Amino acid sequence: AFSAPAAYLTHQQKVLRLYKRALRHLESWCVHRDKYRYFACLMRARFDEHKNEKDMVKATQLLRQAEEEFWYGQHPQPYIFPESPGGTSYERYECYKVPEWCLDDWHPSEKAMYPDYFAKREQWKRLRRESWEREVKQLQEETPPGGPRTEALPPARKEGDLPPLWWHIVTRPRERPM
Amino acid sequence: HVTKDMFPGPYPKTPEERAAAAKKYNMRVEDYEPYPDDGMGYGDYPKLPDRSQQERDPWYDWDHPDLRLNWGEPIHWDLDMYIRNRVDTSPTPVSWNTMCKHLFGFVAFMLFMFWVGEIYPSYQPVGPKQYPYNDLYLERGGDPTKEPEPVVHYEI
Amino acid sequence: SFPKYKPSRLATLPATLDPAEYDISPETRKAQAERLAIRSRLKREYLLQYNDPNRLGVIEDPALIRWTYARSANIYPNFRPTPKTSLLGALFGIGPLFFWYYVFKTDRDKKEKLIQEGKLDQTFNISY
Amino acid sequence: MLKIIIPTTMLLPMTWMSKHNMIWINATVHSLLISLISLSLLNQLGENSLNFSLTFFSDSLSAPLLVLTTWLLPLMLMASQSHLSKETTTRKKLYITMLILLQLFLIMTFTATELILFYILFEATLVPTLIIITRWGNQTERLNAGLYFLFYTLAGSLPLLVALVYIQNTTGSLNFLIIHYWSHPLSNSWSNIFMWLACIMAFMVKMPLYGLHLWLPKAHVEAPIAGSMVLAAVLLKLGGYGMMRITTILNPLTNYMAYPFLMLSMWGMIMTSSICLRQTDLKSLIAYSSVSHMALVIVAIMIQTPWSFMGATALMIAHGLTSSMLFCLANTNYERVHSRTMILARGLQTLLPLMATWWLVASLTNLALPPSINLIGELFIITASFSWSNITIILMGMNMMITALYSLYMLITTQRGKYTHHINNIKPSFTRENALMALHILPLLLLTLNPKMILGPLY
Amino acid sequence: MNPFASLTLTTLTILTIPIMMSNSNIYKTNLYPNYVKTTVSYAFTLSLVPLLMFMHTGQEMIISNWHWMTLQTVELSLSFKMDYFSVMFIPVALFVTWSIMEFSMWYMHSDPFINRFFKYLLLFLITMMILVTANNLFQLFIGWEGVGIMSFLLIGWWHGRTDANTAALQAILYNRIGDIGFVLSMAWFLTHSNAWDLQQIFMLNNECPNMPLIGLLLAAAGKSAQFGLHPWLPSAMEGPTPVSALLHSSTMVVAGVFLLIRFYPLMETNKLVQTMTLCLGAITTLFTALCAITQNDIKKIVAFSTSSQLGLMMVTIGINQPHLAFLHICMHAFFKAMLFMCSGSIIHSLNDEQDIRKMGGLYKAMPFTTTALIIGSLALTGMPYLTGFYSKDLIIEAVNMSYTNAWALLMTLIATSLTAAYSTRIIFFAFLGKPRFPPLVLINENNPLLINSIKRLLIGSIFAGFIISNNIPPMTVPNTTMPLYMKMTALIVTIMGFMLALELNNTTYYLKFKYPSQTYKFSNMLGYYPSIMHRLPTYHNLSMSQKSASSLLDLIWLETILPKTTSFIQMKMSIMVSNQKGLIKLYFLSFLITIMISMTLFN
Ligand SMILES: CCCCCCCCCCCCCCCCCC(=O)OC[C@H](COP(=O)([O-])OCC(O)COP(=O)([O-])OC[C@@H](COC(=O)CCCCCCCCCCCCCCCCC)OC(=O)CCCCCCCCCCCCCCCCC)OC(=O)CCCCCCCCCCCCCCCCC
Ligand SMILES: CCCCCCCCCCCCCCCCC[C@@H](O)O[C@H](CO[C@H](O)CCCCCCCCCCCCCCC)COP(=O)(O)OCC[N+](C)(C)C
Ligand SMILES: CCCCCCCC/C=C\CCCCCCCC(=O)O[C@H](COC(=O)CCCCCCC/C=C/CCCCCCCC)COP(=O)(O)OCCN
């Protein structure tokens, strides 16, 4: 989510992802805590018998057959956290997220209420106004010729500088705005 | 604010115009494949995998999080068919053929057994209920000017 | 020795079951790198156009306009009368019409015949 | 009838003599006053008709259409007030002149005691609409659209004129009263077949019939908001009014000449309802929904039963109101997005809640929710078709389902979901737009209290 | 004079006052939910009187107050029917709605738009009252569509969630599939009987043909979520828990069964429609119970329980016992609404968790909900002398002693056993084991609203069955004699279901793991019906909607035939005519040719 993706996933990453998926579906299968702990230790052991495999052409055949086994017993109704992309409350509060720029359209009668918040709002707007002009130059000078290769942005390197393209990340509405 | 060159064109039939079209849709040259040059006018537009947009990565920071879409990337021809609110081609735990066989076998077996049970009903070792007044002739239909044949019931 | 998963059109094949995500070659890695590079270029362009405080409008997406034009206003200029196209058009534009015409004509012929001969029990059929 | 025609004519000098910053107020106020005056025609009688003079007469089929036509103009003026702001005073006066001329032509067309005058005004309505479409249209395709909107119509109606004069050479008159009282059957002959075709194809093309509807998406998409209003609300009902007026002489030939048109309409309703499901444009979706509803009305007219006529009239009125409101909502969205694409603007109920409520009500009215007059016409036509044939319901039922689908689809894609992040020019809805929405929607819910006002002469 | 009609209309009209007040100042304060709850309670108290009058005398009435319109020989008027079913079902629905609103005042406290939620609930209640009290087919259709629209608006309560919108559209689609049959029935009734009024329909139909009853059965299957059109009810649980507790559990879903009950004079004259109804109910209840036995979401399991109960009531309709089906409606309302309320309390106390894999020891951690759910599950399984026994036991006795399909009887017995089994599953997996939730314990039931709302439904599910059964006149012949084994068949099968479900559930404690079988995969995936039927048809339709209708026909061939061919022909003719080099040689050669041809041709 917050981290930029890479061009490809290494064997280590695929092994870790398979291990996590297997553990999650095992705890979905093994409802109780003691049974899950026993079978998770057993599956970690059976996953550990081939840690020190040296040749890559044989270690890729082990994970390839492990992905054929996981699919067969993958518990077609797994446990999903409520806020996860499959959970029951995934995007429940997504309609309560109102953008900050909407406050620019408030009537002056409504802006009479909450004066300190709006004063801080022009303060933030001015800060962004100078920061963006700095960041355009910083990102233009730091980019390699021909365009970026990965969508990872550099931080701020001077004293008064701010990280390039920061306005829409720090001004997230909230997790539960209302 | 879009140039004439940018818009879709005829089917790319030569390698140079194929490369130009691939560059136009913001994709790799060997990753670009147009629809077959049949009568239907797909033309210049590229053919993307028929994968649904429900199965796209839900953790990548898409520019359109609801649609799981990115700014600039070529949109699938049938995007409106695959919008997470419609048909999705996400892989299932059980193969499609096996699910189809199981579903239709269950339905056919249920229908056949219902028909069989209709052939062989279930009842009680009793005779029909007896109603006194000429099988309730007056209270069921009426017509009191015909005097139907009387029916008497056998007391046992 | 487990049963094998058979992909279908409406139930595709999982990424972890792809037999092409293992037999990796340097050409495949180069292709992935180029894909990431162009994706990052597009993302950088969008983010530069998105965080600008001087922008007070909609960020025009060439891909969206191109998709709409391809779906709407480009179908005819690339149309060519072919046996497949001709047969499909004739079927989908003629067959249903004659099918429904035959069905309704048969039903109404039966109804009119039953009116003429006289056993239809039209009692209480006042409002038509 | 002159007490309404004369003020419509006097609307032109008042507009042309008004100040450069006061034309809209005068036009709106006097149009509303004219509509209030025209409300008097709604007092119809079970007897023959309101025969004002030798030239003009009013019936309970003409009265609701006249009231709707008079009521439409203020809504069109309010809708066009926005996008004509940077327009010069002379060109704004020309636009208002075109609208007033179109209303005058429609008002004279809906009374039209004589058939040749009816045809002349029927074609006179074509000029201001063409000028509006081709002149004040944003996109480059408008000209082509205008061409289509012209030629199709004329291609339909040029034979009709000949047929009309031919009738006056045999019957001797074209007055609708004399035509109705001196009606004689048409024998089964090739000449009578071609006379039937000439009389019917003129009004089939403008309704439009499936297969002749290609001009309608172009004309509605490319026209300005007022043009879309007048085309969807009133200009589509000219074909239905003409067919209900002219089918008095086509019997009993229609009993077997309506089969191709009944089949075409009953399949085209399904085809257009399915087309609405996959559309990248809001205006095209609304236009195809209009095509479906008009195909249902065509089916009703071809059945030729009292319930068919009642349902056809009610459906025409309700569809005109609903399509006008939907086009207004689409234009309100477009004026902020400037793209006219369904999926670019999303999650609008978070930003514009009252507009979301208006969208919900318009979608429900299009969805034919009881006890709206939309469903009154729907059920009347459905029962009449069931009496005509017990199988038609199947098709009808499918249409109903599909209708609801795309309606809610139009409601869900545009209003529900997450808002588009890079669109920050969504200003709060003005009082003008909300007033326009209310003036569109309240008459529907008030007419559902007194349905007999729009059920036609066969009530 | 005549207090019966006045009170019956007054309860309905006072159900409407908060809707009018929704534009006033009270709607902008926090007193609106309490205002609506008090209005509903007062309406229930007022409507308790017509029930007493009917119970004492047997008062029946129809009120035709406002004449809507006269279409030649057919008069449509605002007619209300106040027969046994209406005056009996108004108080039950009002009491359930009052309990659900008092529960919602506590459950939905964090919702910014809570007044809109309450007004939506009241609008649904008004639409259901219109549906129930309708005397003509048009008003019945108005209520039929109003309940569907309210369900659509309440399912997609959270507009941000895509799944909620998908579920709402699915519910609308299935309800419109039912609406097709409803419209068929209305059209046939008006074409043949020349009236949408129930009185004229009953008089003019001594033997009802197949078509109108098939249409009514199709509409009832569409809204009651029978096996053909079932998945929308399980999918409708994306909405808030009170919506599922009120709409999709006890009130809106029984509308199809109520429609079939309203036409019982016409159902007894047809024997094939009864067989179809019996088969549909049996397959529905069996399939839904089999799906429920293996689910892990509590709300989904309770939804499948509701669907199974609806299938059982449809079986009862199919065996020609409408009054018994209405009685089962009345008892199911109470205990299933209370079951959903307990589930919602568990979910709220457990930080918005619905899966039972993260529910552990709640028998002692939160006892009031535990005992309420135990009572509700005992009532559901037809434990003797509870609200569910007095209906379900009679259902079983009637279906055993009827000349009906034997397969349907077997399916009903297996469905009852499976009902006992998944009730055991709920209790075992939600209240018996060790805790499995996150360590931050926030269990709390100490709120007067929740306690009072649950306790009223407890009193209902304990005593209302007895009160109703002993306080209504007899409307069917009793099964006085009974084989001893046949008398206890329901109890035996329910106890066997308890025993087998508990024995199979206790094996999860063992330290043994095994991959699932084919039957488990079939039952857990809802019989594969939601997958295939939501991917094979729709895609194809959508594909056609762009392939044949949109592109091939509208955009290509219909464009090629009339306009483009004309343009091509005119362009070619213009090119041929205007392609003159300007040579007078050719001009006068043509002049000579035409002069020569005219003399020969025209003389
Ligand atoms: C007249 C005398 C009266 C007395 C009569 C005799 C008295 C009773 C005799 C007993 C009879 C059977 C009792 C055994 C009950 C079953 C328990 C069991 O073994 O399940 C475990 C076992 C699988 O366990 P697992 O996968 O290892 O566990 C997964 C984990 O543990 C994860 O597990 P979990 O923790 O997630 O949840 C566990 C859950 C999940 O377990 C499941 O996987 C669900 C599957 C089990 C439900 C089957 C029960 C009823 C089946 C009705 C089927 C109707 C026809 C279907 C048509 C199919 C069409 C192909 O299981 C349960 O909760 C309990 C299961 C149900 C037991 C409670 C009710 C059953 C007792 C009453 C039944 C009959 C007596 C009625 C009395 C009427 C008077 C005569 O299930 C089976 O092996 C299936 C056995 C029966 C299936 C029948 C359908 C076979 C159809 C195949 C095709 C045949 C040819 C068709 C050709 C058609 C061509 C057109
Ligand atoms: C494209 C978008 C829609 C536009 C409108 C489409 C609808 C137009 C169709 C017009 C109605 C049908 C045309 C002819 C109807 C006559 C009745 C005929 O169908 O029945 C048979 C007639 O058989 C044949 O149709 C005879 C004519 C055959 C030649 C006509 C060409 C048919 C195909 C042409 C298709 C071209 C369509 C596009 C035109 C531009 C029965 O034969 P019979 O009972 O003995 O004689 C009946 C006539 N009598 C009684 C006066 C003597
Ligand atoms: C959007 C495109 C639509 C184009 C119009 C489609 C309808 C065209 C129908 C024909 C048009 C002219 C019909 C004539 C008007 C009626 C007059 C009449 O009926 O008099 C007949 C004359 O009948 C005719 O002359 C008809 C001949 C037709 C000539 C024009 C042919 C046009 C194309 C014909 C095929 C099209 C039909 C289907 C069109 C489908 C829609 C495109 C009898 O003449 P008498 O000599 O007095 O009596 C004989 C006994 N003494």
Q: Rounded to an integer, what distance in angstroms lies between the CA atom of residue D109 and that of residue D114?
A: 10
The gap from C-alpha D358 to its chain's centroid, in whole angstroms, comes to 21
Q: Rounded to an integer, what distance in angstroms lies between the CA atom of residue C37 and that of residue A2?
A: 19
8 A C-beta contact, residue E116 and residue E105: no
List all residues 6 or more positions away from A122 whose beta carbon is below 8 Å from its beta carbon. Answer: none
8 A C-beta contact, residue D210 and residue D178: no
Give the containing element (helix H, strand E) for E539. helix E529-546
8 A C-beta contact, residue E18 and residue E35: yes
8 A C-beta contact, residue E129 and residue E93: yes
8 A C-beta contact, residue D223 and residue D133: yes
| Pairwise CB contact (< 8 Å): E145 & D369 | yes
Structure tokens at E226: 């029978």
Bridge partners (DSSP) of residue E134 are: E80
Q: Rounded to an integer, what distance in angstroms lies between the CA atom of residue E112 and that of residue E123?
A: 19
**E516: cis peptide before it, omega within 30°?**
no
Neighbours of B123 (CB within 10 A): 10
List all residues 6 or more positions away from D2 whose beta carbon is below 8 Å from its beta carbon. Answer: D52, D56
8 A C-beta contact, residue D50 and residue D59: yes
| Residue whose CA lies nearest to ligand 1 atom number 29 | E516
Burial pattern D280-302, b for ≥16 Cβ within 10 A else e, equals bbbbbbbbbbbbbbbbbbbbbbb
Residue B61 sits at the chain A interface (C-beta within 8 Å) = yes
Interval between CA A156 and ligand 2 midpoint (Å): 80
8 A C-beta contact, residue E174 and residue D405: no
Residue B66 sits at the chain D interface (C-beta within 8 Å) = yes
8 A C-beta contact, residue E304 and residue E292: yes
Q: Rounded to an integer, what distance in angstroms lies between the CA atom of residue D434 and that of residue D325?
A: 11
Q: At what angle do helices E210-224 and E137-155 cross, to 10 degrees?
A: 20
Q: Rounded to an integer, what distance in angstroms lies between the CA atom of residue E137 and that of residue E127?
A: 14
Q: Rounded to an integer, what distance in angstroms lies between the CA atom of residue E78 and that of residue E138?
A: 9
Query: Among all chains, which residue has been given the structure tokens 């569409």?
Result: E222
Q: Rounded to an integer, what distance in angstroms lies between the CA atom of residue D143 and that of residue D135?
A: 8
Q: Rounded to an integer, what distance in angstroms lies between the CA atom of residue E544 and that of residue D270?
A: 12
Neighbours of D81 (CB within 10 A): 17
Q: At what angle do helices E367-380 and E322-349 cross, to 10 degrees?
A: 160
Contacts of C23-27 spanning 24+ positions with Cβ under 8 A: none
Alpha carbon of E554 to those of E321, E547, E562: distances in Å?
53, 10, 12
Dump the DSSP string for E414-466: HHHHHHHHHHHHHHHHHHTS---S-SS-------HHHHHHHHHHHHIIIIIHH
8 A C-beta contact, residue D385 and residue D377: no
Q: Which one-letter DSSP state was computed for residue D251?
A: T
8 A C-beta contact, residue D376 and residue D452: no
- Taken in order A130, A133, A137, A138, is the CA torsion positive or negative? positive
Interval between CA C87 and ligand 2 midpoint (Å): 23
Question: To probe the interface with C, which of E553, E557, E561 has the most C CB atoms within 10 Å?
Answer: E557
Query: Among all chains, which residue has been given the structure tokens 């007078």?
Result: E584
Q: Rounded to an integer, what distance in angstroms lies between the CA atom of residue E76 and that of residue D448?
A: 13
3-state secondary structure of E408: helix
Neighbours of D350 (CB within 10 A): 23
Q: Is C56 exposed, middle or buried (0-12, 13-18, 19+ CB in 10 A)?
A: exposed
The upper half-sphere exposure of residue E121, i.e. CA atoms within 13 Å in the direction of its Cβ, equals: 33
Interval between CA A6 and ligand 2 midpoint (Å): 68
Which residue from D188, D191, D193 has its CB within 8 A of the most atoms of ligand 2, so it is best to mutate? D193
Structure tokens at D355: 């507009």
Q: Rounded to an integer, what distance in angstroms lies between the CA atom of residue C128 and that of residue D308?
A: 9
Q: Rounded to an integer, what distance in angstroms lies between the CA atom of residue A118 and that of residue D364?
A: 40
Interval between CA D163 and ligand 3 midpoint (Å): 8
Q: Is D147 exposed, middle or buried (0-12, 13-18, 19+ CB in 10 A)?
A: middle
CA of E502, nearest ligand number: 1
Q: Rounded to an integer, what distance in angstroms lies between the CA atom of residue E399 and that of residue E408?
A: 9
- From first CA to last CA, the distance across chain C in angstroms is 69
Alpha helices in D18-61 (DSSP H): 23-38
Ligand 1 and B29: CB distance under 6 A: no
Neighbours of E79 (CB within 10 A): 23
Bridge partners (DSSP) of residue E62 are: E81
Q: Which one-letter DSSP state was computed for residue E71?
A: E
Residue E279 sits at the chain B interface (C-beta within 8 Å) = yes
Structure tokens at A130: 């100078």
8 A C-beta contact, residue E76 and residue D380: no
Name chain B's partners: 3 or more CB pairs within 8 A. Answer: A, C, D, E
Q: Rounded to an integer, what distance in angstroms lies between the CA atom of residue E114 and that of residue E105?
A: 9
Three-state helix/strand/coil letters over B66-128: CCCECCCCCCCCCHHHCCCCCCCCCCCCCCHHHHHHHHHHHHHHHHHHHHHHHHCCECCCCCC
- From first CA to last CA, the distance across chain B in angstroms is 99
- E395 residue type, one letter: I
List all residues 6 or more positions away from D394 whose beta carbon is below 8 Å from its beta carbon. Answer: none
Neighbours of E34 (CB within 10 A): 15
8 A C-beta contact, residue D210 and residue D275: no
For chain E, how many residues are written?
Answer: 603
Bridge partners (DSSP) of residue B64 are: B69
Interval between CA B127 and ligand 2 midpoint (Å): 65
Neighbours of E418 (CB within 10 A): 26
Structure tokens at E318: 């199919």
Structure tokens at E306: 């509701």
Query: Among all chains, which residue has been given the structure tokens 């003008």?
Result: D432
List all residues 6 or more positions away from B110 whose beta carbon is below 8 Å from its beta carbon. Answer: E283
Q: Rounded to an integer, what distance in angstroms lies between the CA atom of residue A95 and that of residue A93?
A: 6
Q: Which one-letter DSSP state was computed for residue E247?
A: I
Dump the DSSP string for E585-597: HHHHHHHHHHHHH
Angular region, D211: left φ>0, alpha ψ -120 to 50, beta rest: left
| Residue whose CA lies nearest to ligand 1 atom number 5 | E493
Q: Which one-letter DSSP state was computed for residue D20?
A: T
- With vertex at residue E187, the alpha carbon angle to CA E182 and CA E193, rounded to the nearest 5 degrees, is 115
- With vertex at residue D182, the alpha carbon angle to CA D179 and CA D184, rounded to the nearest 5 degrees, is 100
Using a CB-CB distance cutoff of 8 angstroms, which residues of chain A are in contact with residue E354? 82, 88
Give the containing element (helix H, strand E) for E78. strand E74-81
Q: Rounded to an integer, what distance in angstroms lies between the CA atom of residue D338 and that of residue B122?
A: 70
- Kindly give the number of the ligand 1 atom that is closest to the alpha carbon of E424: 63
Neighbours of E469 (CB within 10 A): 15
Dump the DSSP string for C33-79: HHHHHHHHHHHHHHHHHHS-TT--SB---HHHHHHHHHHHTSTTTT-
| Residue whose CA lies nearest to ligand 1 atom number 3 | E493
8 A C-beta contact, residue E308 and residue E419: yes
8 A C-beta contact, residue E287 and residue E278: no
Alpha carbon of E555 to those of C90, E6, E304, E311: distances in Å?
14, 61, 46, 47
Using a CB-CB distance cutoff of 8 angstroms, which residues of chain D are in contact with residue E146? 370
Q: Rounded to an integer, what distance in angstroms lies between the CA atom of residue C75 and that of residue C69?
A: 9
Using a CB-CB distance cutoff of 8 angstroms, which residues of chain A are in contact with residue B84? none
Residue E521 sits at the chain B interface (C-beta within 8 Å) = yes
**B36: cis peptide before it, omega within 30°?**
no
For chain C, how many residues are written?
Answer: 128
| Residue whose CA lies nearest to ligand 3 atom number 27 | D194
**D371: cis peptide before it, omega within 30°?**
yes
Output the CA torsion C6→C10→C11→C15 (10° steps).
Answer: 100
The gap from C-alpha D210 to its chain's centroid, in whole angstroms, comes to 16
Q: Is A153 exposed, middle or buried (0-12, 13-18, 19+ CB in 10 A)?
A: middle
8 A C-beta contact, residue D232 and residue D320: yes
Using a CB-CB distance cutoff of 8 angstroms, which residues of chain E are in contact with residue D269? none
Q: At what angle do helices D431-447 and D306-337 cross, to 10 degrees?
A: 170
Residue E66 phi, psi (nearest 5): -115, 125
- D67 residue type, one letter: V
β-pair type (E62-71, E74-81): antiparallel
Structure tokens at D407: 């309606």
Interval between CA D192 and ligand 3 midpoint (Å): 9
Q: Rounded to an integer, what distance in angstroms lies between the CA atom of residue E482 and that of residue E492?
A: 15
Q: Which one-letter DSSP state was computed for residue D420?
A: P
Structure tokens at E150: 């309210």
Of A60, A132, A139, the CB nearest to C53: A132
8 A C-beta contact, residue D207 and residue D297: yes
Q: Rounded to an integer, what distance in angstroms lies between the CA atom of residue A27 and that of residue A29?
A: 5
8 A C-beta contact, residue E369 and residue E362: yes
8 A C-beta contact, residue D385 and residue D304: no
| Pairwise CB contact (< 8 Å): A88 & E521 | no
Structure tokens at B48: 């993307």
List all residues 6 or more positions away from A34 whose beta carbon is below 8 Å from its beta carbon. Answer: E511
Instruction: Provide Rg for chain D, Cα atoms.
Output: 21
Alpha helices in E162-207 (DSSP H): 162-193, 198-204
Q: Which one-letter DSSP state was computed for residue B36?
A: P
| Residue whose CA lies nearest to ligand 1 atom number 98 | B109
Which residues lie with the beta carbon below 6 Å from any ligand 3 atom? D 152, 155-156, 159, 162-163, 166, 191, 194-195, 197-198, 201, 205, 212
The gap from C-alpha C108 to its chain's centroid, in whole angstroms, comes to 37
Alpha helices in D39-88 (DSSP H): 62-83
Q: Is E478 exposed, middle or buried (0-12, 13-18, 19+ CB in 10 A)?
A: exposed
CA of D212, nearest ligand number: 2
8 A C-beta contact, residue E424 and residue E497: yes
